[PDB]
Amino acid sequence: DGRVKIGHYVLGDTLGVGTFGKVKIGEHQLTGHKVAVKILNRQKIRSLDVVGKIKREIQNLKLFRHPHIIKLYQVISTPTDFFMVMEYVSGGELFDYICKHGRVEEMEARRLFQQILSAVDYCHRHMVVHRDLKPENVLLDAHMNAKIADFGLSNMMSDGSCGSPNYAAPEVISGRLYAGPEVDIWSCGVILYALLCGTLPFDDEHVPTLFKKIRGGVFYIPEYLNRSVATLLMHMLQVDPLKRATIKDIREHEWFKQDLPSYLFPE
Template sequence: VAVHSTTGHRVAMKIINRRRIATMNMVERIKREIQYLKLLRHPHIIKLYEVITTPTDIIMVMEYAPFELFNFIVEKGKVTEDETRRFFQQIISAVEYCHRHKIVHRDLKPENVLLDENYNVKIADFGLSNIMTDGDFLKTSCGSPNYAAPEVINGKLYAGPEVDVWSCGVMLYVMLCGRLPFDDEYIPLLFKKISGGIFTLPSHLSPETKQLLSSMLVVDPLKRITIENIRKNKWFNTNLPDYLKPITSSPYDLTSDIDENIINELRKKLGYSREQILRGLKSEGENQIKVACALVIDHKRMINDDTTNHTQTTTSNVSSLPTAIPSSTTTPPSNSIPNTPNTSSIAGAGRNPIATPIRKHKTRSKWHFGIRSKSLPLDIMLEIYKALKKIGMKWKSIDQYHIRVLYESKCNTKIKFDIQLYQIENNSYLVDFKDA
């Protein structure tokens, strides 16, 4: 956990060792999680504020959510129906948001559902997520066995959304009952129970929750309830906050003239040139640029609607924000200035009351460690050398932008530390200090 020195907001730091993820074949999983979280913006999806890369580590600076739904359930035994409904409404809203923008989570479970200080849901861990393409079917067995759908554990083809619905059904059961619907230490027997849809509904459950669970935990994915129909469920809609209600917006035409501000935003977020963006928008079929453009337009609509609704003292609905995936992430050579990937600004970093609409802050903040400068890299290094020389420190060069410093005090105490320069965006650099 870290604290932003200016705003005082707490953030979580996920530090990932490059060598470790390489040996564990997790590079693609981490890259996927960063790419998806980088632009996802929903009140109940964990926010990624910044990614800082070093030669040895990847540091993800994320929204701080101190609790897990899993621990909450363990401590409670089982959750009350009203509390369960509030969590479930937030989860379904976030999952629907992902599906609407072609992302299926594939590993939904209480351990991956975090809770903020006000016990609002924050879905995390998108490492197993995948992009859905119209007409395409996935065939990757992933996720946790107890929460995995029958078609997943049996290696069958699946479109995507239906496996998340099953996992949400298992989570709903766990919250209401305090135990798993499908459980066995012997994995083959567990798979048999899941494949057969064998589970019991305790007598203390209300008829409405029994009906909803029975429609979600259906073995045949074609007969399983959809999120659209969950949205229509009477139990689900009881005390549903306005900000979680479905949005209704008119379709947009990506072939018409696009605002230059939107193009510039896409250039910044995706790293594509203006020509590549225009070419992508004009090309046939679905692509990352079109999805990103549609989401940016949705985001601007949300801001406009929010401003209008605020003036009229009404509550605004949650809308879509950018979720496009860059095609690749390049790692700079060791003798160059390492880059910190660009990220979108913080939206709604403050805490909010339980079950109330979460407003977006309009101030833009950046999360960095160390000292920022817009001077030329060589000028920055020269200033560092001058400062070290002035106070009598010794140093040796590890590479052009990385030095190891030795300080000896009058009482013969020796302190070693590294100073390294990073590029965090165009014409902006970061001087980082760390223990050697």
């Protein structure tokens, strides 16, 4: 041979090095279809005692059907590794696009936020969340569609933006021993803000003062911003998660409902 071939795919460049192993671009030997293969070292899995958990994150992610969540095609099992054959998307990180292009048009921001909000709702409904939404893990494809890695502990990948603690919800910063789905609402509020303004709502070069602005919850609403989406942002970026907007609140908002495609929320 001479090449690392698993199943029908020949592995090539390394897209990133993560927890249980590297992620490499795969290429179907017969069709040429590009693919992203997560390599899960089984000895690493057994050292963390998450064997029964990973096999249920995989078996659960295998039953995921969402156009804006990274799809799992198949899992190939060798005695030493798990090979998760997953969708490859070449558009790069969403926030890398924003930090290089600036704000997008309001219709493009609405289309992308509706895709992201639908994927987040699908994960909260169809899986046991081991991760929270990382806005750095929001990818794009070649058609400018949002692609999200599921919230399982297998997707701890980010190797290979305008800040990093900027996407940390207040209850996460305060070390609250419990956190629910409202943490992802905050992150989506950060995402929506960057889509409409071109920057992050709480950005600060000094990290301690960055945490202070997040706890204060004061962010600059530009006057050019739509007055309706301003109310949505204020509701999503509430410091107190009890007063923070929910998915049903965002789904009912007049700005979110405009030109909403039918396939996103079949519920």
